[PDB]
């Protein structure tokens, strides 16, 4: 389902920033926005 996938992508972003990969976390943020705005 879309609900479970969005949760894991959100978790990936958070973990990436906790590991210091700031640019990768901000990039996944950009990809969360595109994912949720499919409508």
């Amino acid at each position: 389902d879309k609900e479970w996938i969005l949760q894991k992508i959100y978790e990936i972003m958070r973990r990436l920033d906790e590991e210091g990969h700031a640019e990768a976390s901000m990039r996944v943020s950009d990809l969360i926005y595109e994912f949720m705005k499919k409508d």
């Binding site: 609900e3 969005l6 700031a22 640019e23 901000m26």
Partner: protein, 199 residues
């Protein structure tokens, strides 16, 4: 009476884009050639008005909006743009009249180890109206799970912080943006360029 653009541009603390700061400029004279002089300005795009003619013009009222975003996202601070910032943080109208000025602030808004003081809105149920400011911090319900005011499964804090590290590439480096709006209402003009005929 000179317009205090140093309070906006030369300010030390800038706001986050979702809670962008608006300064009213009125009853003053503005020499835009001081700003048109490159005090390091990576962007200087004007709409509905020519940038070389700013000093010859007058306007009913001037709004000065300021915030910080990524270099990638400066393109969205323009009429007819979409994206995380243009849709959820700061929206410009189609008939926008004014200028968008931006410059790199990696020397100011990047702390060794990551500056996380600047925030952006990642989640919103609808797009912003032009010049609308949303500062709500309610938990976003992205799915069918009620959130009850706490973070959890598909229940996210609507704001995410930027990861501003001096090692970032210029696209992920912090950029300070100033958006000058030129209002042309049915009223006497209170802000005139330095080369206006006092009209």
């Amino acid at each position: 009476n000179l317009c205090p653009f140093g309070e906006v541009f030369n300010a030390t603390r800038f706001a986050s884009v979702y809670a962008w700061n608006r300064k009213r400029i009125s009853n003053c004279v503005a020499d835009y050639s001081v700003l048109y002089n490159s005090a390091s300005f990576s962007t200087f795009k004007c709409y509905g008005v020519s940038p070389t003619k700013l000093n010859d013009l007058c306007f009913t009222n001037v709004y000065a909006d300021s915030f910080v975003i990524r270099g990638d996202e400066v393109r969205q601070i323009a009429p007819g743009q979409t994206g995380k910032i243009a849709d959820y943080n700061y929206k410009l109208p189609d008939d926008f009249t004014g200028c968008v000025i931006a410059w790199n602030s990696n020397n100011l808004d990047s702390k060794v180890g990551g500056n996380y003081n600047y925030l952006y809105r990642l989640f919103r149920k609808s797009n912003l109206k032009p010049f609308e400011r949303d500062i709500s911090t309610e938990i976003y319900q992205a799915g069918s799970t009620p959130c009850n005011g706490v973070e959890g499964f598909n229940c996210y804090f609507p704001l995410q912080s930027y990861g501003f590290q001096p090692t970032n590439g210029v696209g992920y480096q912090p950029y300070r943006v100033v958006v000058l709006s030129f209002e042309l209402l049915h009223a006497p003009a209170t802000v005139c360029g330095s080369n206006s005929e006092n009209l």
